[PDB]
Amino acid sequence: GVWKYEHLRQFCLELNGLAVKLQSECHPDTCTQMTATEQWIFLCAAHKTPKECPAIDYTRHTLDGAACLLNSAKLGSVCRRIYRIFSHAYFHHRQIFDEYENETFLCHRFTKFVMKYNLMSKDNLIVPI
Amino acid sequence: GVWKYEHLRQFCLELNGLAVKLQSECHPDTCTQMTATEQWIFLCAAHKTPKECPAIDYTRHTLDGAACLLNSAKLGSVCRRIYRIFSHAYFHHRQIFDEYENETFLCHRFTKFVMKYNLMSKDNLIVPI
């Protein structure tokens, strides 16, 4: 169980690399909500009440919340929310996603990890490989 | 908006009538979980962490929580949870449900109300009429 919290932390570190690459074109005037592909809006959980943060905010606040939870079932929630950073990038920032993935395989590695430890429902794994 | 909280309270009162009828055969040795029809278990929200209460407990704790919230989006959550009392009775206590519904039309009245005020997704309205 201790390795579960541990390996997740390295993922959050590299996921910051993706978030920094994204903030060059994922802006709140155009990515006004956190979405991936269907008619779902995702509400940012880093607030007293879940909030319709723009995608860039959702990304930052969620990574921040995960980094905070880690240095201190809860794993499943963090993983589900972190994964949306990948799905938003894959569907709305495909070029940046592709560049970053070809260099790090981060989404691949993260997907194998949440499946290896049963941390997300397979139904939520909508990004290929 | 004030009528929304108000009409719900009368529903919770009559829903206590159903809960009292159910407690004659909905026991925790046989209804060990709160379920309706599919492979979903419903976790009781009247606890610090959602709990796998037996159906009778889920029913009582949820009605109790709704009565408390009322005399003091939140409406949607209460409605969704209260509705499971109907679906559990309909699928696992069909005779009691049928007797009570023929006398009160409570599920009918409740369903029309949550649709009238858009308080539950229609996807969750699995009990007929």
Binding site: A45, A46, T62, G65, A66, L69, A73, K74, G76, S77, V78, R81, S121 | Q39, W40, I41, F42, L43, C44, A45, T49, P50, R81
Partner: peptide
């Protein structure tokens, strides 16, 4: 962040 899951799908 914080979590409050009230529906679980049976294995």
């Amino acid at each position: 962040e914080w979590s409050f899951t009230t529906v679980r799908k049976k294995p």
